[PDB]
């Protein structure tokens, strides 16, 4: 109890001469509170149930009618040395590892590469589940982006970002903004549920740090009443995620040309939104306008850093795109 009061130091989050008692809900206006973020877990559980139903009953028949392999992976040819290496040394050999395996086994590099690819396919999930998951992600991202556009087109701070801080933190919470924030947090918690326990044969890497940071930001911006500037980020970062899933679906459906077109469009949108618009719009309204309108407050030094971190991550992703798109040309 006391440690929670220590963490929520009113001289750290809120600006100068502003206390949490000023943000208490009353009959005049409604302000965001931390207790409103507890519904996110039940809504995430409901979203996970709906996702399971959609994958098992809706996406699977469509994939079957789309000529998607309903069986599992293939069977690698038997080999004692290769099996021992796969179980002990590694599972995804590189060029040097392939050369070493060819030298040790006195076999061609192509045969060893094919055997290891078959073993990886055995360890990897089937195409049907990935197609269903991609379809669910595409539908959810499309709906989220459409709702974000519809909500933001009428807001006053979309065109003038300085309105995000003019009356901060004394800004009432509307139903649409609360629904948007709760939906985003619920989707991220649903992703956490599907990542942590649905299948433990996964990777906890960049996309998990990214998820954790996104949930961190959405929570500590909602509790700090920084909800007018978080909607811009949420709508900006969900614009390109609706095309990668379509590209994956096209790739799985043996549609190479459609996959290439969707992937190049996704690359263009991703680069433009997260390298051209983000640093000149969101970092502009966060680093400079907030400083000159709200003044210096400690929590600022936190939030900006995290945003910069996100930018760095997306820069890394740009690398992983810029080469692949070169192959797509």
């Amino acid at each position: 109890a006391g440690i929670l009061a220590w963490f929520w130091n009113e001289r750290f989050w809120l600006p100068h001469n502003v206390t949490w008692a000023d943000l208490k809900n009353t009959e005049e206006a409604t302000f965001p509170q931390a207790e409103d973020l507890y519904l996110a877990f039940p809504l995430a559980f409901c979203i996970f149930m709906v996702r399971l139903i959609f994958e098992r009953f809706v996406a699977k028949p469509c994939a079957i009618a789309l000529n998607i392999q309903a069986n599992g992976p293939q069977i690698a040819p038997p080999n004692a040395i290769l099996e021992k290496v796969f179980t002990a040394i590694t599972k995804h050999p590189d060029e040097k590892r392939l050369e070493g395996l060819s030298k040790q086994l006195d076999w061609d590099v192509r045969s060893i590469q094919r055997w290891f690819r078959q073993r990886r396919n055995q360890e990897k999930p089937s195409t049907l589940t990935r197609f269903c998951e991609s379809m669910w992600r595409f539908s959810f991202y499309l709906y989220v982006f459409t709702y974000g556009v519809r909500f933001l087109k009428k807001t006053p701070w979309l065109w003038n970002t300085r309105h995000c801080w003019y009356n901060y933190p004394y800004q009432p919470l509307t139903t649409d903004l609360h629904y948007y924030y709760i939906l985003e947090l619920s989707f991220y918690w649903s992703l956490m549920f599907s990542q942590f326990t649905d299948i433990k044969r996964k990777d906890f890497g960049i996309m998990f740090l990214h998820h954790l940071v996104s949930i961190f930001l959405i929570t500590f911006s909602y509790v700090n009443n920084m909800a007018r500037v978080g909607t811009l980020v949420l709508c900006l970062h969900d614009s390109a995620d609706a095309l990668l899933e379509a590209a994956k679906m096209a790739n799985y459906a043996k549609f190479q040309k459609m996959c290439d077109l969707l992937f190049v469009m996704f690359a263009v949108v991703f680069i433009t939104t997260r390298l051209g618009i983000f640093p000149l719009w969101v970092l502009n309204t966060t680093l400079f306008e907030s400083w000159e309108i709200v003044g210096p407050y400690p929590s600022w030094w936190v939030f900006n850093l995290l945003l910069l971190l996100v930018q760095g991550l997306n820069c890394f992703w740009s690398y992983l795109i810029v080469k692949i798109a070169c192959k797509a040309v």
Partner: nanobody
Amino acid sequence: QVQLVESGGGLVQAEGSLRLSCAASGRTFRTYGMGWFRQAPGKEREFVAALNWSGSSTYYADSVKGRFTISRDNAKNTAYLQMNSLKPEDTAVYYCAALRRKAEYGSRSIADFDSWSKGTPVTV
């Protein structure tokens, strides 16, 4: 949700200087954006100046910008309006108001301000 009382009104010679004061009896004066309006003989009320709770951002009218300065003191729970190089057109009744917790910053309409006041006459 606050009570506003104005002072500093009176009659001064041409090209004079006046300092109108607007005081509130409450602890919530620091959480509202204050504003000053004028009402000349005839026509209707006109917007003069306004500012947010922190006082960092202030915005005036087109015809009064460069001569009027609006400021606030949250320690004393008061707002000040200083006039420089007065003109005969400035003779009017001045009213002190406040944004009603929902109107966006930059509003220049009568309906956006709830807590009005008696006002003071200013004659040049």
